[PDB]
Design a protein around this ligand. Structure first.
Ligand SMILES: *O[C@](O)(c1cccc([N+](C)(C)C)c1)C(F)(F)F
Ligand SMILES: *O[C@](O)(c1cccc([N+](C)(C)C)c1)C(F)(F)F
Lengths: 526, 526
């Protein structure tokens, strides 16, 4: 029956989920790696030992152990992103939504979620692959990975806790998809990995790491690149933040293995509790345990690789939302509040920019300000609120992406770039926040298709328009069946994505990105 | 008779010059210092020994020895500025245009001409004080000073050739005006010194030098400040450029006096010939023999003085033309030509900016470019032509002036700032050049009043409008009898000066001036 399936690891019993007027089959929580509990914590994942009997794949698996956002309790805007299941170290599971009837072999899309590498869940409402699967006849898969210390603690010298262990979980799920998606109807030759934020930056890491390239065909990255300032740390930094977390729990730091044993004994929440006390600076949009450039997962520095075309050459579809900074400012910058216009004083703006460029020396701070402040209006509540938003977005998402784009277009097999600039009519976040980072996701996964969600018809439209552009690109390497042009180092065309007729622009944030990508760094070495 | 006059130095016989329908009296070429010829070359000026008999003051005196501009022969645009008389070391003379009938005591305006301190003449057509004298019932005086090596050679240690000797000539003429203008009808208590370019920057130097403050009441500075990058050099620099000129003439450089004797023997043109070979860098808008900060004429560095309110506190009227760079680019920058649109390649633009910021290190050059280039149009002939114009103007006239303005408004007794942005209908220079530095002068001196000069009526209007604003300010300390507001460090209001209704703006080139006045210098010390 459509619901019962035989895979190399065993047979799994699925479920038939209703979607819109019809139905679809969902296989939820298929394990793909041995439960990283016990002395296997921090260790790399093992492959799932084959099972006896049918594996009931009808319900969502536990979420990984992580930091829950309590700032705005009851607030949907803040909670849609929170673990909707029992957090547990045994969280390495995978989910698949297959059309009905099940296909012969069709395009597969593996979704990798974001969360600053400190949070994330595959089981959450805005990640329901069903509308996309059903609407575009596609096999949607969502995987899970160890976030935080659990997935990214990095005591390089050791084998008991090397870094990127959580980036390896992504890989091992990609493997299983590769080895078994045929039994579900997917073409293992046409598997597209798409992700957002840390997900989209993870996506770009698999395009880079030699060991992952062969396991997928093409990539979609939304608001994130592996070259982002918050996505990677040196083996060194990873070492220190490792011991810092060590001090915080009163661990014998004298011996790497005694440090590892201590950490391996502490309950999970004890780790999550002080997770943030280890960052080395007062700063916003920066996280604790992130991937390291270890020479294994990454044979070399990312810029070297980017420079020398040392990466999988395929076609990529990458984008960036309009207001990338908001969320981050409203969370860690003094001045921004949910219930107000967050007009900013120049006393706050100055500390805002200190928090955004944590590496900046005085002159660095000085140059950032010269670029972002209106001298015809030194202190303007609004002007500084927005100017700060752009400082965060440009430096943390836009400029790094545009860099990866330009460096990659030279060796890749076709690139498509977009600019999502549309605030959902039903958005629950304050208007000043605008087109918030993370709010295109819902359009991509087709939420506007459900009436009971209160979106305008123009939005149902833009959802179908996007979902297609997406699916169509997965199957083909070109979003086109409008007429989305190709990004080219020469013209640098890109397009807006909103409910208005598709316009084609050029040079996204070129002015500001030469400052961030070329000037600032050159200045900072003096 | 109106024409015969008795002054402390002797009696002078004048002339009656016709002006418009009427007539006026002109006294041309009254000496005010002993002829700086002979071993007095480079020495400071002596006062004119009183004369026997009447001094016939009916014709223009010789012009000082200087560099004649031959680039555009026959071209009016280029020659209106050239010596119209016999150049001669015996050029220390003064001119006075008195109304008819001669007044009791009325406002005096002493005009100090510009020319990068390397050129200038009092006797030239656009400096005819007659229209202004006659129209506003004012006593107009024009003085002369030794330009170039003759007036500014600076071997500090020596008394035989200390610097600023040519700035002392200005002073001694100011003295004579002070001691004798009453016999001509002028109120020695109401004497306004106005100047343009090096003249206007000389004006600001007398506001600064303790020794000059008491000799004049108020100041008008047009396109120049003493704090301009080309207006002053260290005692040191003056020494080296002194010996460089020494090498160039094969002088015994071993002894300061042997160096001075050699120079004092060489004919004048021999000095003018190699005048330019001594500058220490490839650069535009920079001159050879300029005033030095010697501790005498200037008790201290200009910025110290500016900072500590160490300057004559009166009211000043200062301005800046729209296109301040043109002239300089079209003369020393590769790419600009008189007969073409001078669209600039980015290969020329880059050498343009190297020529403008001769002190800039790579990063300096890099920051200047980030600020002045349109990234949405990297190479655009026009864009770069204009962007280069602004680089020159801002860095060489606008920003230094705005700085002096802001620093002075804090201690001064009233400041009025303007922005001349009007291209004369009959302008002979190419249009790209726009509102050229030096082309307001003609409006101030009332040329548009003569029909045979082909100006529009709107221009006759703007000429009378300006001449009044000027005269009225001399007599009162306020240009107002429209409504030109006061410059204030807070509001920073200023107004446009053209044939359209007077508009009041704010913050002239604020954006760019914080880069030039604050950022660039801070960056450059790293
Ligand atoms: O992961 C991001 O895109 C990110 C950070 C924090 C929170 C979210 N979400 C709310 C879950 C979408 C996304 C980051 F860190 F790279 F910006
Ligand atoms: O003296 C200036 O204002 C100047 C320089 C060169 C030529 C002229 N004029 C053509 C005579 C008016 C003016 C300077 F050097 F300060 F910009």
């Amino acid at each position: 029956s459509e619901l019962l399936v035989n895979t190399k690891s065993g047979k799994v019993m699925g479920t038939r989920v209703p979607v819109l007027s019809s139905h679809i089959s969902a296989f939820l929580g298929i394990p793909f790696a041995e439960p990283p509990v016990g002395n296997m914590r921090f260790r790399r994942p093992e492959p799932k030992k084959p099972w006896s009997g049918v594996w009931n794949a009808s319900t969502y698996p536990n979420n990984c152990q992580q930091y829950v956002d309590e700032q705005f309790p009851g607030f949907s805007g803040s909670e849609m992103w929170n673990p909707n299941r029992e957090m547990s170290e045994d969280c390495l599971y995978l989910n698949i939504w297959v059309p009905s009837p099940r296909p012969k072999s069709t395009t597969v899309m593996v979704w990798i979620y974001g969360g600053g590498f400190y949070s994330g869940s595959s089981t959450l409402d805005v990640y329901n692959g069903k509308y996309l699967a059903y609407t575009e006849e596609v096999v949607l898969v969502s995987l899970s990975y160890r976030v935080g210390a659990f997935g990214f603690l990095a005591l390089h010298g050791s084998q008991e806790a090397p870094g990127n262990v959580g980036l390896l979980d992504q890989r091992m799920a990609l493997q299983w998809v590769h080895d078994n998606i045929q039994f579900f109807g997917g073409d293992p030759k046409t598997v597209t990995i798409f992700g957002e934020s840390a997900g989209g930056a993870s996506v770009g890491m698999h395009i880079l790491s030699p060991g992952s390239r062969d396991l997928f065909r093409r990539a979609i990255l939304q608001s994130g690149s592996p070259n982002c300032p918050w996505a990677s740390v040196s083996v060194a930094e990873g070492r220190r933040r490792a011991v810092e977390l060590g001090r915080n729990l009163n661990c014998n730091l004298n011996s790497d293995e005694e440090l590892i044993h201590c950490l391996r004994e502490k309950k999970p929440q004890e780790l999550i509790d002080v997770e943030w006390n280890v960052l080395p600076f007062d700063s916003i949009f920066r996280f604790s345990f992130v991937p390291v450039i270890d020479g294994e997962f990454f044979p070399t520095s990312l810029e070297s690789m980017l420079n020398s075309g040392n990466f999988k050459k395929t076609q990529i579809l990458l984008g960036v939302n309009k207001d990338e900074g908001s969320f981050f400012l409203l969370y860690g910058a003094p001045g921004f509040s949910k219930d107000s216009e967050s007009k900013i004083s120049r006393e706050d703006f100055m500390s805002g920019v200190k928090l955004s460029v944590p590496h900046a020396n005085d002159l660095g701070l000085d140059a950032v300000t010269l670029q972002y402040t209106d001298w015809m209006d030194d202190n303007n509540g609004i002007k500084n609120r927005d100017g700060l938003d752009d400082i965060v977005g440009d430096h943390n998402v836009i400029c790094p992406l545009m860099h990866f784009v330009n460096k990659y277009t030279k060796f890749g097999n076709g690139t498509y770039l977009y600019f999502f600039n549309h605030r959902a009519s039903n958005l629950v976040w304050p208007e000043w926040m605008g087109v918030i980072h993370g709010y295109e996701i819902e359009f991509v996964f087709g939420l506007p298709l459900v009436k009971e969600l209160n979106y305008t018809a123009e939005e149902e439209a833009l959802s179908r328009r996007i979902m297609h552009y997406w699916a169509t690109f997965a199957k083909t390497g070109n979003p086109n069946e409008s007429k989305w042009p190709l990004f080219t180092t020469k013209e640098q065309k890109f397009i807006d994505l909103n409910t208005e007729p598709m316009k084609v622009h050029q040079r996204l944030r070129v002015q500001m990105c030469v400052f961030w990508n070329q000037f600032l760094p050159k200045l900072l070495n003096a």
